[PDB]
A paper describes a structure:
Recently, [name], a yeast member of the conserved [name] intermembrane space (IMS) proteins, was shown to mediate PA transfer between the [name] OM and IM in cooperation with [name]. [name], another conserved yeast IMS protein, is a binding partner of Ups proteins, and facilitate their import into mitochondria. Surprisingly, two distinct polypeptides of [name] and [name] form a single compact domain, the [name] part of which corresponds to the START (StAR-related lipid-transfer) domain, likely functioning as a lipid-binding domain. Like other START domain-containing proteins, the [name]–[name] complex contains a deep pocket that can accommodate a lipid molecule and an Ω-loop likely functioning as a lid for the pocket.
The full-length [name] (175 amino acids) and [name] failed to cocrystallize, yet [name]ΔC5 lacking the C-terminal five residues and [name]ΔC5 grew cocrystal. The crystal structure of the [name]–[name] complex was determined from its SeMet-labelled protein crystal by the single-wavelength anomalous dispersion method using the anomalous signal of selenium atoms, and was subsequently refined to 1.40-Å resolution against the data set from the native crystal. The asymmetric unit of the crystal contains two [name]–[name] heterodimers, which have a similar conformation to each other, with root mean square (r.m.s.) differences of 0.6 and 0.3 Å for 168 and 72 Cα atoms of [name] and [name], respectively. In the asymmetric unit, two [name] molecules were found to form a domain-swapped dimer; the two [name] molecules exchange the identical C-terminal helix (residues 135–170) each other. Therefore, the domain-swapped conformation likely arose from the crystallization artifact, and we thus refer to the monomeric [name]–[name] heterodimer, in which the C-terminal segment is connected to the polypeptide of the remaining part in the same molecule, as the [name]–[name] complex. Like free [name], [name] in the complex with [name], takes an antiparallel α-hairpin (α1 and α2), yet the C-terminal segment, which is disordered in free [name], forms an α-helix (α3). [name] embraces [name] with the three α helices, covering ∼1,400 Å2 (12% of the total surface area of the [name] molecule), rendering the [name]–[name] complex folded into a single-domain like structure. A closer look at the crystal structure of the [name]–[name] complex indicates that the hydrophobic side chains of Tyr20, Phe24, Trp27, Tyr28 and Phe32 in the α1 helix and Trp46 and Tyr49 in the α2 helix of [name] bind to the hydrophobic region formed by Phe15, Ser19, Phe23, Thr39, Arg42, Leu50, Val84 and Pro86 of [name]. The entrance of the pocket is nearly closed by the Ω1 loop.
Author numbering:
A (entry chain B): 1 to 168
B (entry chain D): 1 to 169
C (entry chain C): 5 to 76
D (entry chain A): 3 to 77
Write the structure that this text describes.
Amino acid sequence: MVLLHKSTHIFPTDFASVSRAFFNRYPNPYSPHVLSIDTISRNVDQEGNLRTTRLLKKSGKLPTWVKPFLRGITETWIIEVSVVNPANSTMKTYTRNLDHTGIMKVEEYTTYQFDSATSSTIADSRVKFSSGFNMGIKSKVEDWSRTKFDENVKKSRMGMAFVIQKLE
Amino acid sequence: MVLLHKSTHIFPTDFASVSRAFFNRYPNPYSPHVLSIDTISRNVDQEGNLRTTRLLKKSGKLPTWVKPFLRGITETWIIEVSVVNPANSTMKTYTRNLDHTGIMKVEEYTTYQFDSATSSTIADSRVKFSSGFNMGIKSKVEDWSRTKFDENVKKSRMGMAFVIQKLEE
Amino acid sequence: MSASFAPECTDLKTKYDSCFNEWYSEKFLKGKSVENECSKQWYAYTTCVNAALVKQGIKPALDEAREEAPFE
Amino acid sequence: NIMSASFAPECTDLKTKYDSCFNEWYSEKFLKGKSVENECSKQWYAYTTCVNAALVKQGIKPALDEAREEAPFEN
């Protein structure tokens, strides 16, 4: 299963301000669930672009209706990868959870591009939710079927035996 | 998805007794959930075999973990089709639920065949469980993704705007 | 005795089933005659059931299933 | 003045010093085409040494190592 979502936003600010804010986004009052963020690697490549990989830890709570299907999950590790190109004022960013991917993988691509004509920075986001676990439903369906079959096999056999004796 | 289960049982009784029992198996203490049974059609075909179709109503309850995602089910209608061949002492039977098939369809083929060698009636059962429905969990996962996406869109831009303002002052 | 899904038809079902059981064991299985010696009981019973089935939501599903052939 | 923490508490102060140095370099040098080298080497290495030591003991390490070999922008 794959679900795609997209959104766009315009920050009426320049590239230096938006990109600097991205690197210093935490902490902020809107994301109290971000427990920490570390810079894992950073360098300037041969093309003069800044390459950065960061690691975030975020707490959360599973929806009530999910709890039975899934084990206890209160936090997730997230990788954040970015490339800043000062030549064309473009910053590509990507994030995805590192753990729990067997249950659900959430990948986000958000690009910030400065637009000289409007003196603003446009942010285009694309998020993909992927999973083939189906909340482990297949196995639960198999269990139900196995139990139902066994139950019916016995009831059918014993019921027939009972009736045969009554008539006999 | 399709799941297949098989089982065989030997009734140390003759064909008349086993087939008679099948037609009169209700009620019996092992099937307390069978509320009723009716004969819908019955006739002898061109082969001389007896063809019967019956309708059963049985009370039941979906698995507790599914209830929160599926409507309240308390009973199910089952069709029972059979063919009795008096010449070969064989009785083929078939049953399947008529309703709730969008959730799960259970088809059972049980054949009773008398075996002279052992003076017994062999009952071979094959049951197929077919379900392509995910208990209505899927759409809820989709609902979850929409909610998560909207939440993150806003937290991301509000957080960014907050820091831009802080680093701009 | 097992009941009919339509209580008002249970009496007729009992009488039909009784006639059929006798015929099945004493005639059909013994290859004596394949004629329905229970035509009156069957007509009365099935008329009662069909009248009740028209009001049942399962009717369409049943009519559909009756046209299918599980034994190939 | 509350700074963001490192996942390893013992590395938070080092992270604060590195981030501070990086922010100045980024805005004053990198974005202005004045530098492409690490003028925050001392702060960076002290910090990453701390983080790497902590990562060795984290269950997520294998997943992180794998992700670092991937190229989301498909390079």
